[PDB]
């Protein structure tokens, strides 16, 4: 049937009134996609939710609907966020919707070329700092404060209440909850939606109860380390982020569901970075395939027993960064003359 | 509701056989928008198609589903291309998916940034030449004609087979067909598409025909010039086309639903795309967005009348070319010291 955005389609579990605006970019009901090689080569049963197909890319647009509308809805006329990008992207793009103005802090050098032509083209307003992602964070939630601009950040609720929906819709497309949901962590937000959606979900429908299993980037693993911290690195520069807004919630989630969050390196994201693409024909951006790289690391390790049936979350679009895609990849366009015999020739001999 | 892609849902109209390999990422279903502010500034009912949210962020993926399909079904183990760049994405994912190896042959420079670094991603063997997509497609073809490697171009039919499904979406997300298609042209096959699957659902479902309006970008306006153009130029590199080949199917498709292929400046699709983004919040890449450009043009010239039911095809995801969007916006980020009080201060000036 049709699809007419996640403020329609999930009004009874979010906070919308009769006063609360129709703005719909169409988000939400992103595939859930079964990969059946890597099922094959890993012993379970892998699915993976494709948030990159949302609007603006990214799983940003679920709680970036509501908390507009909502801003939107109380009377404010101008938003605000920090951003690694796909934040920022979201509010901006449902701000243009909305006919808000629009603010951003993003990390100066730090944040995918895609996600910045985003911010540009949606019409922001954007401010570039030489500090990461939590100065930013800091900064903006002072502003907020001190101004009558809307903060649209995760400690934001309506955010969360937004996100929630992701873990409906994989119970409705699963027709079960799964054994385990993996997703990455950056600043948390995510998994404390996901687990607060299986929560709801299970009393209001049945459903069972997943193992949330959350995965920061070694580089910025202040969870897993259970320290913040000041200088996070990672090529994933989505979960560059070192002083998670979340943490709490997170480590409740983990901690109610029998989860655990865990590290993931660089290098593994890397890894499973290329090999959903080239094996499933799947392209999310890096800092989404910490999860990937995590049901890789707890397959092999035992922790997630063969057999589980698994979603990952794939929480971007890849092609927001197309930088690490050409950077780190071996295949390389080879320049032959416009000569159908060399060509012919080199795809023979090659 | 539940959607688990072409194949499956439009089977009956699709040349699925039992064979036929189960092939999906889940493409199609795509978002009909309507755009409530254009509508208003131009005096139609404007909705857009946007089908950058289709698994390789654009509509190729439609017609690669079946094409590669096929492919499989009939034995192949390869399959190739010739591209601006989105046809090779499509081509490169569905192979991946498909266990099949892809060779996809691009012009040099003039693929959008996004589009290269999935063929690189998903795996394709990436031949790039000094000559531009209608060298590249007349080496392709040629090539296919002698060895054992399947052409998934869109003159292979099944391409346009999946492609009409477009329409069949439309006309249901609507309610009914609307009075025009407005669509970019490049190598004409999607135009073609879309008629097609227009006619089939008129025959079957009772649904009206609507006008198709097709627009090329004037650097690469053959079809419009009636001439093969040896130098196709755009910044919409997507359309940058001189020789599209399939030129005949989409003046039968202007002609059967008296509609029109025009063309629209760089700088109309360039205002197009800008205007997009920012008054309705949806980014498409500039090569879709002459299917906007065209709406504005023949609703100023009065060829789409005020009231007018108008569907426009948006065919390719803004971030297929992020360079293109940070060239032509003025809007340039500002670096501030890393101090809320600073900070605060230029916000409220
Ligand atoms: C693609 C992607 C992201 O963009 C992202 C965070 N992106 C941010 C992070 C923080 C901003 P917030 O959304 O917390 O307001 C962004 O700015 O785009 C994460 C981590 O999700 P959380 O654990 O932070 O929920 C995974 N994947
Ligand atoms: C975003 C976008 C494209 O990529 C594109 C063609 N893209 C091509 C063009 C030709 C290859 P074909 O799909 O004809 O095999 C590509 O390679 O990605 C067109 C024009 O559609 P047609 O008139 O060609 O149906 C509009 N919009």
């Known amino acids: ?110 944040i995918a070329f895609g996600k910045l032509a985003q911010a540009v083209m949606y019409g922001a307003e954007i401010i570039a700092i030489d500090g990461n992602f939590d100065d930013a964070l800091k900064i903006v939630r002072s502003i907020c404060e001190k101004s009558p601009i809307a903060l649209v950040n995760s400690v934001n609720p309506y955010r969360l209440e937004g996100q ?10 699963l027709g079960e909850a799964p054994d385990v949901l993996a997703i990455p962590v950056g600043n948390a937000g995510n998994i404390s939606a996901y687990w607060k959606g299986f929560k709801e979900y299970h009393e209001k429908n049945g459903t069972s109860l997943p193992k949330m299993r959350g995965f920061e980037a070694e580089g910025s693993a202040a969870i ?31 901690e109610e569901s029998n989860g655990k969050i865990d590290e993931v390196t660089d290098d593994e994201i890397l890894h499973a970075y290329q090999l959903i693409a080239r094996e499933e024909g799947v392209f999310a951006e890096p800092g989404s395939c910490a999860s990937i790289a995590g049901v890789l690391k707890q397959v092999k390790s035992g922790e997630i027993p063969k057999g589980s049936k698994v979603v990952a979350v794939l929480t971007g679009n890849g092609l927001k960064d197309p930088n690490t895609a050409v950077d780190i990849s071996e295949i390389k366009p080879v320049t032959l003359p416009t000569n159908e015999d060399s060509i012919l020739e080199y795809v023979k001999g090659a």
């Open 1 to 110: 049937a049709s699809w007419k955005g996640l403020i329609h389609q999930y009004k009874e579990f979010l906070p919308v009134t009769d006063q609360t605006p129709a703005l719909t970019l169409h988000e939400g009901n992103t595939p859930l996609i079964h990969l059946p090689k890597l099922s094959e080569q890993l012993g379970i049963e892998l699915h993976v939710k494709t948030e990159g197909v949302n609007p603006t890319g990214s799983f940003k647009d679920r709680g970036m609907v509501m908390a507009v509308a909502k801003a939107k809805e109380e009377g404010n006329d101008t938003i605000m966020c920090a951003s690694t990008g796909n934040t920022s992207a979201a509010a901006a793009a449902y701000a243009a919707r909305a006919n808000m103005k629009c603010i951003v802090i993003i990390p100066n050098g730090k």
């Open 164 to 173: 929630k929906t992701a873990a409906f819709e994989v119970c409705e497309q």
């Open 224 to 254: 897993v380390r259970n320290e913040v911290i000041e200088n996070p690195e990672t090529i994933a520069t989505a979960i560059r982020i070192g002083n998670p807004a979340s943490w709490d919630k997170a480590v409740k989630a983990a």
